[PDB]
From a paper:
However, when activated by WISH/DIP/SPIN90-family proteins, Arp2/3 nucleates linear actin filaments. We found that SPIN90 forms a dimer through a three-helix domain N-terminal to the armadillo repeats, facilitating bidirectional actin filament nucleation by activating two Arp2/3 complexes.
The SDD is connected by a flexible loop (residue 363–376) to the seven armadillo repeats (residues 377–717), while the N-terminal 38 residues of SPIN90-C are not visible, likely because of flexibility. In our bidirectional filament reconstruction, Arp2 and Arp3, which are bound to adenosine diphosphate (ADP), are both flattened and adopt a short-pitch conformation. SPIN90 and SPIN90* contact each Arp2/3 complex through two distinct interfaces. The first, as previously defined, involves a 936-Å2, primarily electrostatic interaction of the armadillo repeat domain of SPIN90 with the ArpC4 hinge helix. Our structure shows that the ArpC4 hinge helix conformation matches that in the branch junction structure but is bent compared to that in the SPIN90-inactive Arp2/3 cocrystal structure. The second, previously uncharacterized but equivalently sized interface (buried surface area = 1,081 Å2) forms between the N-terminal end of the armadillo repeats of SPIN90* and Arp3, with an additional minor contact with ArpC3 (buried surface area = 362 Å2).
Author numbering:
A (entry chain E): 1 to 174
B (entry chain A): 3 to 39, 53 to 416
C (entry chain F): 2 to 168
D (entry chain G): 2 to 153
E (entry chain D): 1 to 282
F (entry chain C): 1 to 290, 320 to 372
G (entry chain R): 310 to 362, 369 to 482
Write the structure that this text describes.
């Protein structure tokens, strides 16, 4: 059967490059509009993370799938740093520092999906992309730390750090 | 007096022996052979349960995907099956063997080349495994109400097959053959635990994965909803398995989590293990039946017989019977729309039954058969071998000419 | 019962004479490319058969053609226990004929083994090494049988001791 | 699967009754009267006195290649094959070196015919003959045995 | 496994399952099992009259009339005793083990249940082994048809017991290898000096049996066993009988298993040649 | 004495352009790869992909620059270089079996294809439909045709077959040329007339080449018997039976001497004396290299004349099953072998 | 222009020397022909400078080829689920041969080759051995892997972060 795709795409949803500039519920600042609903492109990708890393074939139906694939690849970067953390406060400090890092973007080397992603043509669209992703890289990390850490010991769970070796298909943002 | 026939279902995991006429086999042993690590030294070997425990011997598994790979060992595996366990003088007893559908002809030829020349048997019949499993179900069924028409799903350790049967005749050109089975489920649990639960010795990872599979595992209605149930309410769904080390004799314990439903899921998401296969078994069955003649599509949906040890999973038919009825009630809906909506066609009565005998279903259909007189007609014979040669056993129903 | 050096010297020369091959498309079927020595539809493309022999039993038969050669061989079998071990040995050599690319899955009638060498083997494989395999076969086969006859006799003693010792 | 229609038409072979089959040519002049071949009394009278080297050339002078008859060929083979078997092993190089090219090729034809049906010691001799004729005539002598459409 | 086992697995396996269940207090489970052994033997384990507490090990030897003679009816009684009861229908002997009236130390009655075929053959040997010890000569030989196309002649003398097998080799590849195996039994007294003497007449029988309607053929084989009193005495007649009633099957076991040794060795030499050809592959 | 291994597999056929600047090999496949001579290197420039089967014969017309191919798919294609790419042009051979050889004519107005259909197809152009229609010559022939060569009159044709013969035919096409001048081979040369049929009937004729004078033709056989017929001497044949493996292709370097090559994996030379009326072995040409002892490590299937024509050749090319192409320099062999003489 | 690097590859192939002693042997030979034969000093000094101070375009080192062949089989033998948990074929002698060869390369060859082929594709080849170690139970092979890990830690410190963060 197929993997889990994004249901949130709507024709009224803006496009950046060939991705889906979708609303995000965050206190962080960026080009992403603020959402009112109780579900977002982030809460989905965290719902569907543990299941989508076992599949080996993903068919890109729309552009919101290109936004989900990015997060699902970045969550595997959070867990590499979080498994080394001994307290949630130490994780939130590590999740900040990682989002500030300038990962590759569509068009340049490092990005594993340069072919099936559309780079920004103009410089203004480039500046919007680098600030949309950084808004995802920050709210993703902030929301994992609520889940990874067992409140009984305030230390990472083996049920999340078992997916450290499970890349999305085999790709990584590095 | 007149002697019954020997029956042997050499499978990937377990091997089923005995004589005809009986209801359950006289032996059920793993398909292993223990050898040392010229002269009479090729006879220092053990098979079955006498092979696992042997410390100074190397355990070998000569069968993969139902087919044999090293006939140097299987010729030694069969000369203890006969002379040690069964204690049969093969020049007197006929024989019934089993093959999967996709067994090559050259393996059927080397089989008969072994039994007829080396062991000098007077007869031999190489039957299809899952077909015998359907005859067994008919005895559980009422007498006279026997349904000759039925679909069969036989999944063991090596490979999984879907075989339709209509009015007694096998529709061989519509068979499917899914390479996913209990060995792929086991190596997938053996993988998830190496990532999470270190503390399992490498010598006891396999023993630990079968134990989890046979006991704790099950089948889920939806995958991602189970991950939440294991996360949100972990005390209820996470079990614990205490083992015993074999060196220090100290216990080791682990937490049994996502591998309870992820192993069996590869029946429905087989790209978890094998990237060369994506289609679920719920869809393979629909193509098997929709490729069959239009008149025997309904009776085949109504008798889907699960056989094999890797269909013992809890709630396996409940999901297969549900993934089909979704697929079948839609197709009838679409046709009702294209026609004009003037006729509401009759619904199809899907039924997936899971019969009481599974560990020896195929053997049982071979014992009922061998106890007949009709068996002694279709059996290839020593005389027919000397004349025609080992190509007498070259053909199977899966192909023509 | 002549000698072994000249026998292999004759066979080696006849083989170099008969491995003068080239591709050749068929003239009875549209675009087939078969070895004409096997199908034998075109008599003109079939060279003569020539035989070599140390004696009545041992001999070689080179059936050549424009695009194929067939080298049947008869091995000496003094006693019955050698007829058996040679018959099995070829069966286990024919079963792996997809790995011996120059081999027939059955032998010519009257002979114990038969090779078949097409014009695609000489283009790919080294023509002079294929000959050295046929020759190496013909002088080692006698050694590899007596080594089995001696291995059967050694086994029969242990099977006797392991029974009589218990008395 | 299996078929249930008459498939017997695929058994009969029509290629037997074909008009494009190859036809090799024969000598018309020899069908009426065959070449007499080496007469036995000629060679034999030269064998009684031990003149092997001349009984040798007498057998290779006449050869019924153009003859369609097989007995005179067989009689001819038994004559020359009787001669080669009686030679002295040291005298063979003396005899082979005398022959012209076209006699060495005809010799090697008769040699590869002696290997077909051997006596007790007919082949240990012919392998020595084969060594000498090859030293003179080379592989090209054998090729004119393979390509030869007319047997000896 | 070089030597064949004399005690059947299915009986020792089946009874010990019942005997370990009942003595654990669990309830009895039914059973109906038909199976076989060598020499045309046919067993039958059953719950008689449906009584799941009783199990009845029967057996159907042909040639048992030859064994009721020589006093095997008494030999078997001296072993099992109470367990021996009236024969089941179509069968020659029938034991009966009561699951509620079991003794402790069950491994002895189990191990004796597997040896039922042995205890039947063990009469004709103990009778003739005693004749040598008593010095009785002039008694008649014992013709036993342990198979339809085979026969076992026994005979006793002052200093030796002579045991003959009129075996048969179906294929001609077996009679060729068989001469090799028997040609080394004859020389078996070179290593094991105390061992019995063995002989082998290919087609024709010996002189002791030419009058006795023996069979001749290009595939038959006559095999003799000369047993001296260091075998037939009371301390060794058990282990001697445990080997002699398995000889015909020991010989054929190793003819069929020698082929696998040959096959096992040609798959290797074939791979040695295949290294020489791959020299031609660039 | 060069050796450039284009590949490891055979080279069924080859052809050179006028300048000898480009070469068109078939690397044992359905494609024709055109390589250009850039200095001391070889660079591939084009690849012709139209055949449904293996190629067996190629010829390059020097003036028109029109390549013609024949393959096992019962097809031929006439290629014209339009701009930067080669475009084919269809051919109608009308043969039920596969083709084996092709040769352009001297005047480039026709070509002849030899096939396993027991025929030879004389092809010419038809602008009415852009086709190349063909006429057949299949009167005496009884089996496959292996080689061909054109007389300098642009009419007469020689053909070596597996019928053990080297016939000579008149490929006169009235629509494209006037009647020819007479020749010592005969005056009566209508379409499809057997002028000369050889006498030998042992061995398959692999190669055939006409002499520059047009009065001498030689042919090689699998019987290890080179031959040569002279029309001035009433079509008498002179053989020279060799003592080695056969030859597979020949060509006249002069009016008297030839060069052959084949399964012996090197070239040789053959000298003709019409005074005596025989051939003589001119010795091996390539020196034994300082198992095989030459450049070609397998057989040779095609020999061609680059420089000097058949009148007096200075360089000839060999193309073999060892994926190789060796250029030879004739005078360098004269110098490197003081015993060697080219008559 | 590139002699000093094309000679070291020739010498390590036909001698088996380490990287260090490959440069010593050339510096000694050259430095001695320069001194004994002053007529050749200009050529020799260029050759020495090529050593003190890259390879041709398509030319690839021998040690780099082997590490493509070794890391590829050991990862193929890791992904062979049947043979690991359900053994049929013999593997101890082949694996012991590839791990010995690996240990002589990491220990002797140029570290920058053995660094990049281990740092390639985010340490894909290192992390496999780390899993094959977890999967293997035979101490004859667990011991050679340890000697190989101990040689990979000496090359770079990014590999140490990869192993310690692993299982
Ligand atoms: N309760 C169970 N649940 C799931 N699998 C089981 C159960 N019991 C046995 N099995 C599996 O059945 C498999 C063997 O199936 P079977 O068909 O009997 O043998 P084979 O596969 O060799 O033909 C084993 O791999 C075993 O793990
Ligand atoms: Mg099974």
């Amino acid at each position: 059967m197929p993997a889990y795709h994004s249901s949130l795409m709507d024709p009224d949803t803006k496009l950046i490059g060939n991705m889906a500039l979708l609303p995000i519920r965050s206190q962080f600042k960026g080009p992403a509009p603020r959402e009112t609903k109780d579900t977002d492109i982030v809460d989905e990708a965290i719902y569907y993370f543990k299941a989508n890393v076992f599949f080996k074939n993903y068919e890109i139906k729309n552009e919101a799938d290109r936004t989900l694939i990015y997060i699902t690849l970045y969550i595997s970067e959070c867990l590499k740093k979080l498994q080394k953390c001994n307290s949630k406060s130490q994780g939130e400090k590590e999740m900040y520092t990682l989002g500030i890092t300038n990962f590759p973007i569509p068009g340049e080397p490092g990005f594993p999906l340069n072919a099936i992603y559309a780079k920004p043509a103009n410089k203004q669209e480039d500046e919007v992309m680098r600030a949309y992703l950084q808004q995802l890289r920050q709210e993703t990390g902030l929301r994992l730390c609520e889940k990874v850490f067992d409140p009984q010991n305030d230390k990472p769970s083996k049920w999340w750090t078992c997916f450290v070796k499970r890349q999305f298909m085999n790709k990584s943002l590095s | 007096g007149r002697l019954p026939a020997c029956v042997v279902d050499c499978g990937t995991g377990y091997t089923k022996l005995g004589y005809a006429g009986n209801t359950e086999p006289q032996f059920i042993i793993p398909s292993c052979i223990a050898i040392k690590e010229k002269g009479v030294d090729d006879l220092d070997f053990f098979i079955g349960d006498e092979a696992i425990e042997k410390p100074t011997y190397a355990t070998k598994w000569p069968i993969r995907h139902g087919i044999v790979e090293d006939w140097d060992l299987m010729e030694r595996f069969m000369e203890q099956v006969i002379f040690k366990y069964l204690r049969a003088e093969p020049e007197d007893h006929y024989f019934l063997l089993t093959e999967p559908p996709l067994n090559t002809p050259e393996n059927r030829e080397y089989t008969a080349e072994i039994m007829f020349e080396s062991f000098n048997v007077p007869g031999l019949y190489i039957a299809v495994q899952a077909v015998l499993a359907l005859a067994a179900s008919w005895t559980s069924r009422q007498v006279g109400e026997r349904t000759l028409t039925g679909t069969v799903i036989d999944s063991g350790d090596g490979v999984t097959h879907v075989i339709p049967v209509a009015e007694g005749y096998v529709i061989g050109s519509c068979i499917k053959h899914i390479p996913i089975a209990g060995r792929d489920i086991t190596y997938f649990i053996q993988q998830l635990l190496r990532d999470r639960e270190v503390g399992i010795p490498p010598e006891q990872s396999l023993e630990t994965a079968k134990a989890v599979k046979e006991r704790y595992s099950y089948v889920c209605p939806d995958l991602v909803k189970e991950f939440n149930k294991y996360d949100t309410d972990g005390s209820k769904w996470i079990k614990q398995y205490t083992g015993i080390n074999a060196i220090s004799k100290k216990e080791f314990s682990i937490d049994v989590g996502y591998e309870r439903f992820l192993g069996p899921e590869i029946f429905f998401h087989p790209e978890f293990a094998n990237p060369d296969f994506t289609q679920p078994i719920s869809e393979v069955v629909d193509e098997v039946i929709q490729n069959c003649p239009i008149d025997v599509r309904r009776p085949l949906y109504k008798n889907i017989v699960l056989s094999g040890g890797s269909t013992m999973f809890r709630d396996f038919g409940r999901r297969l019977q549900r993934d089909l009825k979704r697929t079948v009630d839609a197709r009838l809906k679409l046709s009702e729309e294209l026609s004009g909506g003037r006729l509401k066609p009759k619904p199809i009565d899907v039924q997936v039954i899971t019969h009481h005998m599974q560990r020896y279903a195929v053997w049982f259909g071979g014992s009922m058969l061998a106890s007949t007189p009709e068996f002694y007609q279709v059996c290839h014979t020593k005389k027919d071998y000397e004349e025609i040669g080992p190509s007498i056993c070259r053909h199977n129903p899966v192909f023509g000419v | 019962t002549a000698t072994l050096r000249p026998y292999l010297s004759a066979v080696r020369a006849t083989l170099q004479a008969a491995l003068c091959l080239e591709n050749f498309s068929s003239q009875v079927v549209e675009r087939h490319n078969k070895p004409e020595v096997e199908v034998r539809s075109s008599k003109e493309l079939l060279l003569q058969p020539v035989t070599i022999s140390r004696n009545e039993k041992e001999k070689v038969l080179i059936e050549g053609s424009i695009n194929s050669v067939r080298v049947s061989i008869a091995v000496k079998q003094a006693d019955e226990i050698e007829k058996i071990l040679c018959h099995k040995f070829m069966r286990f050599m024919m079963m792996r004929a997809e790995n011996f690319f120059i081999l027939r899955r059955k032998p010519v009638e009257g002979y114990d083994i038969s090779f078949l060498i097409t014009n695609f083997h000489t283009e790919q494989m080294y023509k002079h090494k294929l000959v050295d395999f046929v020759i190496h076969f013909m002088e080692e086969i006698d050694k590899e049988i007596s080594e089995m006859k001696l291995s059967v006799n050694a086994r029969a003693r242990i099977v006797a001791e392991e029974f009589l010792k218990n008395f | 699967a299996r078929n249930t229609l008459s498939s017997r038409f695929r058994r009969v072979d029509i290629d037997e009754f074909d008009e494009n089959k190859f036809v090799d040519e024969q000598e018309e002049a020899a069908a009426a009267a065959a070449e007499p071949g080496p007469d036995p009394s000629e060679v034999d009278g030269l064998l009684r006195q031990g003149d092997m080297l001349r009984a040798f050339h007498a057998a290779l002078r006449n050869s019924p290649v153009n003859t369609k008859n097989q007995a005179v060929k067989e009689r001819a083979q038994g004559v020359v094959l009787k001669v080669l078997t009686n030679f002295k092993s040291s005298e063979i190089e003396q005899a082979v070196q005398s022959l012209d090219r076209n006699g060495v090729d005809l010799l090697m034809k008769y040699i590869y015919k002696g290997f077909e049906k051997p006596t007790e010691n007919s082949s240990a001799v012919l392998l020595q003959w084969h060594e000498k004729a090859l030293a003179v005539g080379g592989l090209g002598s054998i090729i004119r045995v393979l390509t030869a459409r007319k047997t000896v | 496994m070089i030597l064949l086992e004399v005690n059947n697995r299915i009986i020792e396996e089946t009874l010990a399952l019942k005997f370990e269940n009942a003595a654990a207090g669990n309830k009895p489970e039914a059973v109906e099992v038909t199976f076989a052994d060598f020499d045309g033997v046919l067993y039958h384990i059953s719950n008689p009259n449906g009584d799941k507490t009783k199990v009845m090990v029967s057996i159907s030897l042909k040639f048992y009339k030859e064994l009721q003679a020589h006093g095997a009816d008494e030999l078997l009684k001296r072993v099992y005793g109470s367990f021996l009861v009236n024969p089941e229908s179509g069968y020659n002997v029938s034991l009966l083990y009561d699951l509620e009236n079991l003794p402790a130390s069950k491994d002895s009655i189990v191990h004796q249940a597997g040896m039922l075929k042995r205890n039947c053959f063990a009469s004709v040997f103990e009778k003739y082994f005693q004749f040598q010890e008593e010095g009785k000569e002039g008694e008649n030989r014992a013709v036993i048809h342990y198979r339809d196309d085979e026969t076992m002649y026994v005979e006793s003398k002052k200093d030796r017991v002579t045991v003959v097998f009129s075996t048969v080799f179906k294929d001609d590849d077996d009679v060729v290898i068989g001469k090799v195996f028997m040609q080394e039994f004859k020389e078996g007294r070179r290593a094991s000096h105390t061992a019995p003497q063995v002989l082998f007449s290919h087609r024709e029988p010996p002189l002791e049996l030419k009058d006795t309607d023996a069979a001749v053929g290009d595939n038959i084989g006559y095999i003799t066993f000369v047993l001296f009193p260091r075998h037939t005495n009371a301390s060794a007649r058990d282990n001697t009988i445990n080997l002699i009633h398995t000889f015909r099957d020991y010989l054929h076991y190793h003819i069929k298993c020698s082929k696998a040794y040959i096959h096992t060795r040609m798959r290797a030499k074939t791979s040695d040649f295949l290294k020489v050809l791959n020299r031609a592959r660039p | 004495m060069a050796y450039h291994s284009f590949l490891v597999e055979p080279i069924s056929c080859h052809a050179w352009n006028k300048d000898r600047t480009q070469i068109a090999i078939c690397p044992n496949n359905h494609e024709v790869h055109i390589y250009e001579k850039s200095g001391a290197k070889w660079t591939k420039v084009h690849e012709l992909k139209e055949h449904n089967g293996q190629v067996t014969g190629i010829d390059w017309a020097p003036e028109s620059n029109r390549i013609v191919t024949c393959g096992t798919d019962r097809n031929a294609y006439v290629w014209t270089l339009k701009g930067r790419t080669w475009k084919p042009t269809l051919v109608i051979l009308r043969i039920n079996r596969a083709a084996r050889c092709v040769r352009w004519a001297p005047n480039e107005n026709k070509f002849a294809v030899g096939s396993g259909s027991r025929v030879i197809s004389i092809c010419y152009f038809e602008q009415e439909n852009d086709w190349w229609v063909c006429k057949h010559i299949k009167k005496p022939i009884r089996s496959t045709v292996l080689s061909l060569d054109w007389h300098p009159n642009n009419v007469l044709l020689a053909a070596g077959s597996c019928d053990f013969k080297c016939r000579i035919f008149s490929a006169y096409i009235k629509e494209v040329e006037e009647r020819p001048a007479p020749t010592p081979w005969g005056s009566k040369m209508p379409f499809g007339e057997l002028m000369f049929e050889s006498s030998s009937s042992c061995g398959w004729v692999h190669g055939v080449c006409f002499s520059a004078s047009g009065s001498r033709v030689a042919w090689v056989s699998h019987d290890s018997t080179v031959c040569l017929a002279d029309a001035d001497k009433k079509m008498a044949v002179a053989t020279l039976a060799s003592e080695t493996l056969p030859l597979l292709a020949l060509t006249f370097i002069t009016d008297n001497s030839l060069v052959a090559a084949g399964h012996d994996c090197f070239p040789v030379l053959f000298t003709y004396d019409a005074a005596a009326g025989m051939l003589s072995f001119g010795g091996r040409l390539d020196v034994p290299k300082q198992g095989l002892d030459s450049l070609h490590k397998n057989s040779v299937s095609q020999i061609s004349v680059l420089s000097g024509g058949k009148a007096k050749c200075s360089q000839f090319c060999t193309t073999g099953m060892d994926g190789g192409m060796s250029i030879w320099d004739v005078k360098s062999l004269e110098s490197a072998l003081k015993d060697l003489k080219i008559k | 222009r590139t002699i000093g690097a094309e000679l070291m590859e020739l010498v390590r192939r036909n001698t088996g020397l380490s990287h260090e002693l490959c440069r010593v042997a050339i510096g000694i030979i050259v430095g001695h022909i320069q001194a004994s034969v002053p007529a050749s000093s200009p050529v020799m000094e260029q050759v020495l400078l090529s050593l003190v101070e890259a390879l041709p375009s398509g030319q690839v080192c021998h040690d780099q080829q082997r590490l493509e062949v070794i890391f590829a089989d050991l990862a193929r033998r890791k992904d062979d689920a049947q043979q690991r948990s359900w053994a049929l074929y013999e593997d101890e002698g082949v694996i012991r041969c590839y791990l010995e060869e690996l240990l002589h390369i990491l220990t002797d060859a140029d570290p920058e080759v053995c660094k990049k082929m281990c740092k390639r594709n985010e340490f894909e080849s290192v992390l496999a051995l780390v899993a094959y170690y977890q999967m293997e139970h035979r101490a004859s092979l667990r011991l050679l892997l340890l000697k190989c890990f101990g040689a990979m830690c000496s090359l770079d410190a990014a590999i140490i972060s990869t192993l310690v963060s692993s299982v």
